[PDB]
Design an enzyme around this catalytic site. Structure first.
Site, PDB file in Angstrom:
ATOM      1  N   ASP A  45      21.541  13.586  34.146  1.00 40.37           N
ATOM      2  CA  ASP A  45      21.372  14.949  34.234  1.00 40.37           C
ATOM      3  C   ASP A  45      21.932  15.576  32.977  1.00 40.37           C
ATOM      4  O   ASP A  45      23.373  15.678  32.773  1.00 40.37           O
ATOM      5  CB  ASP A  45      22.241  15.473  35.443  1.00 40.37           C
ATOM      6  CG  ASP A  45      22.311  16.952  35.687  1.00 40.37           C
ATOM      7  OD1 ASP A  45      21.426  17.738  34.896  1.00 40.37           O
ATOM      8  OD2 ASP A  45      23.335  17.484  36.386  1.00 40.37           O
ATOM      9  N   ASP A 229      17.242  20.574  30.488  1.00 39.33           N
ATOM     10  CA  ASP A 229      17.943  20.389  31.649  1.00 39.33           C
ATOM     11  C   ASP A 229      17.106  19.346  32.721  1.00 39.33           C
ATOM     12  O   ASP A 229      16.351  19.682  33.568  1.00 39.33           O
ATOM     13  CB  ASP A 229      18.353  21.458  32.458  1.00 39.33           C
ATOM     14  CG  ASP A 229      19.345  21.294  33.681  1.00 39.33           C
ATOM     15  OD1 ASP A 229      19.784  22.095  34.193  1.00 39.33           O
ATOM     16  OD2 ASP A 229      19.401  20.044  34.397  1.00 39.33           O
TER      17      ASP A 229
END
Ligand SMILES: *[C@@H]1O[C@H](CO)[C@@H](O[C@@H]2O[C@H](CO)[C@@H](O[C@@H]3O[C@H](CO)[C@@H](O)[C@H](O)[C@@H]3O)[C@H](O)[C@H]2NC(C)=O)[C@H](O)[C@H]1NC(C)=O
Ligand SMILES: CCC1(CC)CC(=O)N([C@@H]2CCOc3ccc(C(=O)N[C@H]4CC(C)(C)Oc5ccccc54)cc32)C(=N)N1
Length: 357
Positions: A45, A229
């Site tokens: 992430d 992201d």
């Protein structure tokens, strides 16, 4: 103005983590925790930094259905004498737990003394729809909630063969998706890599100068930004713009057999990063979902950056663009490099890294 070069590296200095695309939409790798090793399958992430592991301290249904990490079975697990509680709230759920230290192995590389969050509670819910086991956060250390050393920084400090960079190859229909630590592989891209300076080391955040859907300028009247992201599958726009986008980008019924024709006349999206123009074709930003073609977009207002931040996610962006994340130091900015993804990739044949001149 000073360029980077793609330079060859020996295979052990760029390690490859196969990412499996689960039916619940997570791209998960393999991570070994403690000794004897316990195996978890976290996402990777770039939109957060904490390392989270789901543990036998969470007895909720959403945690019990996965392979929970048991710290009482680990010879290397350590708590500090004075504990710390951690409680993270995000749009689709919340994660709360305590802090600990552990030894991790990622790609055969060992990291000791790594602070991580032990999940104790997943209830505010997204966790009811996914088989969540953990997060390897890859954001900047400023986003750490606890500990002095992020996982990536700590991994590098104990493995001098690694360069402070990583890249993502997202190809879910191929089972070739790969997280790469320490460099890149020319097997995964074609053309040139173009670098974008990171304007604030918190998210992986770069200047965004405009957005077009066909001929309609959707952005920007005020200074805007893009955030790479991997923790979101969708691209995002702020509310003010998100309504205008869906107004010109409607959904449509679709099947694997007719979507090419259904979408033939949809508009091309363009993102403007200075002189670099990235375009997304309808078959790249639209996805098949329950007998329907829908834009892989959602509304997100990022409180910092004043809701002028646009996110680029795993499915609506990185599937089409190989992305490299280069860690800056001192007077040198961090950067994101973007190149057209190579669809014919199979395995990473050779590997390289981006060196700064
Ligand atoms: C993980 O963290 C532990 C705890 O900080 C690290 O252990 C520490 O390592 C340092 C350097 O190896 C040791 O320094 C030594 O201190 C003595 C005085 O006690 C000094 O005279 C020696 O010359 C030496 O520099 C320190 O003692 C040691 N602490 C403990 C409690 O063992 C460990 O290095 C970390 N592991 C990794 C892989 O970074
Ligand atoms: C991972 C969550 C956090 C860190 C705790 C917090 C956080 O909100 N974001 C972003 C910021 C922008 O807004 C959103 C909006 C939504 C989502 C979301 O629902 N993500 C799903 C994706 C899926 C199902 C593949 O895997 C998991 C696995 C666990 C949790 C969520 C997901 C993510 C983000 C992170 N980047 N990281």
């Amino acid at each position: 103005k000073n360029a980077h070069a793609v330079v060859e590296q020996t295979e052990e200095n760029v390690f490859l983590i196969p990412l499996k695309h689960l039916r619940d939409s997570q791209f998960v790798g393999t991570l070994l925790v403690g000794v004897p090793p316990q195996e978890i399958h976290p996402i990777f992430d770039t939109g957060s930094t904490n390392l989270w592991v789901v543990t036998t301290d969470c007895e909720e249904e959403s945690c019990k259905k996965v392979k929970r990490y048991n710290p009482y079975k680990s010879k290397t697990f350590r708590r500090s004498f004075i504990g710390k509680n951690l409680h993270i709230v995000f749009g689709s759920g919340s994660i709360s737990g305590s802090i600990g230290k552990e030894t991790f192995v990622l790609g055969d590389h060992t990291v000791r003394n790594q602070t991580f969050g032990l999940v104790e509670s997943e209830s505010n819910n997204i966790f009811d729809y996914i088989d969540f086991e953990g997060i390897v956060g890859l954001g900047f250390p400023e986003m750490l909630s606890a500990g002095k050393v992020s996982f990536f920084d700590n991994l590098l400090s104990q493995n001098k063969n690694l360069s402070p960079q990583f890249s993502f190859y997202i190809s879910p229909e191929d089972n070739t998706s790969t997280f790469l630590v320490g460099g890149v592989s020319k097997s995964f891209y074609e053309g040139s890599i173009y670098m974008l300076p990171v304007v604030k080391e918190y998210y992986w955040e770069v200047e965004l100068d405009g957005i077009y859907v066909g001929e309609k300028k959707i952005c920007c009247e005020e200074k805007s930004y893009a955030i790479f992201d991997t923790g979101t599958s969708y691209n995002t726009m702020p509310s003010a713009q998100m309504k205008g986008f869906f107004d010109v980008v409607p959904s449509a019924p679709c099947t694997e057999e007719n979507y090419q024709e259904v979408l033939k006349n949809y508009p091309v999206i363009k993102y403007l990063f200075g002189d670099l123009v990235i375009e997304l074709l309808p078959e790249e930003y639209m996805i098949l979902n329950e007998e329907s073609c829908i834009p892989a977009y959602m509304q997100i207002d990022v409180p910092s950056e004043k809701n002028h931040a646009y996110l680029l996610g795993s499915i609506a962006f990185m599937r089409h663009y190989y992305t490299v994340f280069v860690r800056g130091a001192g007077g040198q900015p961090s950067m994101v490099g973007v190149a057209k993804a190579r669809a014919a990739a199979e395995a990473a044949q050779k590997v390289a890294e981006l060196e700064n001149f």
